[PDB]
Paper text:
The RIO kinases (RIOKs) are an evolutionarily conserved family of atypical kinases that are present in all eukaryotes, most archaea and some prokaryotes. The RIOKs have the protein kinase fold but lack the sequence motifs involved in substrate binding, including the activation loop. All three RIOKs are found in the pre-40S ribosome, although involved at different stages of the maturation process. The deficiency of RIOK1 or RIOK2 prevents the formation of mature 40S ribosomes, and in yeast both RIOK1 and RIOK2 are essential for cytoplasmic maturation steps starting from the 20S pre-rRNA.
A construct containing RIOK2 residues 1–329 gave crystals when combined with inhibitor 9, and from one of these crystals a complete X-ray dataset was obtained to 2.35 Å resolution. The final model contains 10 molecules of RIOK2 in the asymmetric unit. The overall structure of human RIOK2 closely resembles the structures of RIOK2 from the archaea Archaeoglobus fulgidus and the fungus Chaetomium thermophilum. It has an ordered winged helix-turn-helix (wHTH) domain on the N-terminus followed by a kinase domain. The most relevant conformational difference seen in HsRIOK2 is in the ATP-binding P-loop formed by strands β1 and β2, which is folded around in the inhibitor in the human RIOK2 structure. The co-crystallized compound 9 is bound in the ATP-binding site of RIOK2. The 2-aminopyridine moiety forms two hydrogen bonds with the hinge region of the kinase domain, to the backbone nitrogen and carbonyl oxygen of Ile191. The pyridine moiety is tightly enclosed by the hydrophobic side-chains of Met188, Ile109 and Ile245. The P-loop folds around the inhibitor such that Ile109 from strand β2 and Met101 from β1 can engage the top of the inhibitor. The major reason for the selectivity of this inhibitor series for RIOK2 over RIOK1 and RIOK3 could be that Met101 is not conserved in RIOK1 and RIOK3 (which both have an isoleucine instead), and Ile111 is also not conserved (histidine). Eight of the ten RIOK2 molecules in the crystallographic asymmetric unit, eight molecules were seen as four RIOK2 dimers, each forming the same dimeric arrangement with a twofold rotational symmetry. This dimeric arrangement has a large interaction interface that involves the binding of compound 9 in an extended aromatic stacking interaction that includes His200 and Tyr194 for six stacked aromatic rings.
Numbering used by the authors:
A (entry chain A), B (entry chain B): 2 to 135, 146 to 301
The structure:
């Protein structure tokens, strides 16, 4: 057997309206008053409070009281559900499995469509830090923006024959993409030909730089090795322009990180590693993604 | 003499209201129609079109026509002016000098108050990349958010006796702080005692980690050495939680970057470098800044 996946909880037009109302409410309120939710949701029967209590019970929204405001906010599970239900209505996702990895700022899950074909889901989680020494609904917008940027870059890189997953669809903070069957490099113990995997990694750094991009977090946690020892890049959250005044330092750091890992894990060392002076710009993906 | 600084351009309350109206308009529009700007500004004498032409002439806004829409948007110079004029009305900034450094995502200028005391200004510049392979008012919000986070972290770190500049004030994408007199480590050729500067750098990585933070970009471009060979951190845009599943890799990368620089520039090497296992959490600045 393969990984277990659970069908998404059923969602009524009522639940979706109230849930959407809470989301809209959070543009202008850290805690959305129950009266504002009721008027935005405008249910035909106006048992809005019953529906909210039911959404609390299912952990999709949470109750909070400050000094002189009290009401509701979307939970991570609520935001997740809105994204996954939207993707479900486009026949992209039917079922969700357990978390089976992380990016720098994302959680990675296996999902399946109605036919039981498996895909990778990335849920972006930004705005985690709270600021109180001076608004903290930045997490909705920032997470949505990461997912959008990941989908756009993944599409642009895939079309330019880079070793990245085929992106399928996105909504809010959720990106669905080709599942890559293999192991992150960090949990590979032996390889028949380390030189070959090292070369793929170094050629990927060069090709990114030739397109105007430095990964910035290039490592054994972001690179998956498949059944035929080819690498796929699965996370690129904070890429730097080759035009940055300190671009060379970022480029060298990514190169040194790969060298350090290949020495530690495989006792492999080489002189076939790029310098920034080798880069010949061919594209402008740091300026515009098209 | 010291660095040249120029008094901020004079602007009438009318001109400043129209520029603020364009900014408000951009909450809901990539391109703000002239009619919407006029109704938001609501000038007593209604010469709004004259004022807009004058703001174009001074490069504070730009005119654009698409197929669907035609009107105005804030320029970088316009956003800069709004921030600096606001800081000017609080007596924080009277005069602006030339750019004299960069952070990873910010431009650094010398500014002066009315008495001619010099300070550092950081203008945050995010949302540089354009996405067209599928809204682009993200640059206002993201830049504002970087500045806010920098001010908050700088205050929290300063109060906890970290070697950072004393933060003074912020508005929009602008942060004003203590000017640190010295050289970025990257432009230091010799030091009497490299071991001592290396130790300060390594103790700073440990103290950050003890407070829940990994810098993530710790380098010779972010650290300024003053007249008495003490280091000050002047940029920390993308800090990582010590709770990150790959926290150890980020911590080690910051340590290796300092080691590599001290070997390259000063031929200095040491075994007095921290490991992640040494860290004993003392604070929660990765979760909440207070
Ligand atoms: O991470 C992986 C490797 C992997 C594959 C199956 C797994 C099954 C069960 C548990 C872990 C598993 C890990 N792929 C990946 C990552 C991002 C995007 C696309 N694909
Ligand atoms: O970067 C510097 C060093 C420095 C000082 C004076 C300069 C004058 C002319 C030219 C460069 C200059 C550089 N300080 C700093 C940075 C961020 C925040 C606060 N202070
Ligand atoms: Cl529905
Ligand atoms: Cl509806």
């Amino acid at each position: 057997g393969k990984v277990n996946v659970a069908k998404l909880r059923y969602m009524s037009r009522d639940d979706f309206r109230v849930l959407t109302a809470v989301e809209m409410g959070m543009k202008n309120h850290e805690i959305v008053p129950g009266s504002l939710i009721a008027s935005i949701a405008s249910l035909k029967h106006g048992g809005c409070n019953k529906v909210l209590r039911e959404l609390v019970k299912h952990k999709l929204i949470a109750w909070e009281r400050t000094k002189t405001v009290q009401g509701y906010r979307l939970t991570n599970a609520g935001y997740d559900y809105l994204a996954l239900k939207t993707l479900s209505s486009r026949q992209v996702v039917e079922s969700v499995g357990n978390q089976m990895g992380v990016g720098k700022e994302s959680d990675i899950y296996i999902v399946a469509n109605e036919e039981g074909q498996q895909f990778a889901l990335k849920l972006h989680r930004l705005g985690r830090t709270s600021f109180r020494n001076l608004h903290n609904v930045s997490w909705l917008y920032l997470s949505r923006l990461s997912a959008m940027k990941e989908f756009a870059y993944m599409k642009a890189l895939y079309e330019r024959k880079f070793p990245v997953p085929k992106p399928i669809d996105y909504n809010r903070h959720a990106v669905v993409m080709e599942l890559i069957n293999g192991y992150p490099l960090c949990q590979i113990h032996h390889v028949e030909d380390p030189a070959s995997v090292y070369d793929e990694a170094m050629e990927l750094i060069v090709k990114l730089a030739n397109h105007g991009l430095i990964h910035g977090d290039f490592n054994e946690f972001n690179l998956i090795l498949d059944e035929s020892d080819h690498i796929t890049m699965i996370d690129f959250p904070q890429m730097v322009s080759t035009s940055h005044p300190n671009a060379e330092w970022y480029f060298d750091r990514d190169v040194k990180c790969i060298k350090d890992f290949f020495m530690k894990r495989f006792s492999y060392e080489s002189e076939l590693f790029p310098t920034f002076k080798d880069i010949r710009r061919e594209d402008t993906l740091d300026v515009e993604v098209s």
